[PDB]
DNA sequence: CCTATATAGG
DNA sequence: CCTATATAGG
């Protein structure tokens, strides 16, 4: 399935897009929270590095709560 | 380095 | 209030 590779405390981490709870933009940074094994995890990626699915959840987050 | 940015999180 | 993320440079 689709995955997003992001940094976390100096290391590359990966998470399935299906686990993402909320995604939002901060300029060129795309931040998000995810269900992390029962607790909330966080991550962010550069907009250029975001996978399509994440950018769609983004557009549908704000470009779909207008 | 720092401050700011959006957001969530007992 | 603090922290974590990418980027700006206000």
Swiss-Prot record:
Localization terms from the record: Cytoplasm
GO cellular component: cytoplasm
Assembly, per entry: Monomer.
PTM sites of type N6-methyllysine: 5, 7
Statement: the UniProt record of this protein carries the keyword DNA-binding: yes
Name used for this protein in its record: DNA-binding protein 7d
NCBIfam families associated with the record: Sul7d (NF045555)
Miscellaneous comment: Sac7a and Sac7b are truncated versions of the Sac7d protein, most likely resulting from post-translational processing, or degradation during isolation.
Lineage: Archaea, Thermoproteota, Thermoprotei, Sulfolobales, Sulfolobaceae
Thermal effects: Hyperthermostable.
Organism the protein comes from: Sulfolobus acidocaldarius (strain ATCC 33909 / DSM 639 / JCM 8929 / NBRC 15157 / NCIMB 11770)
């Amino acid at each position: 399935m689709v995955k997003v590779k992001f940094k976390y405390k100096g290391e590359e981490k990966e998470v399935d897009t299906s686990k993402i709870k909320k995604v939002w933009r901060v300029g060129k940074m795309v931040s998000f929270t995810y269900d992390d094994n029962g607790k909330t995890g966080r991550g962010a990626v550069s907009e250029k590095d975001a996978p399509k699915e994440l950018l769609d959840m983004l557009a549908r987050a704000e470009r779909e709560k207008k």
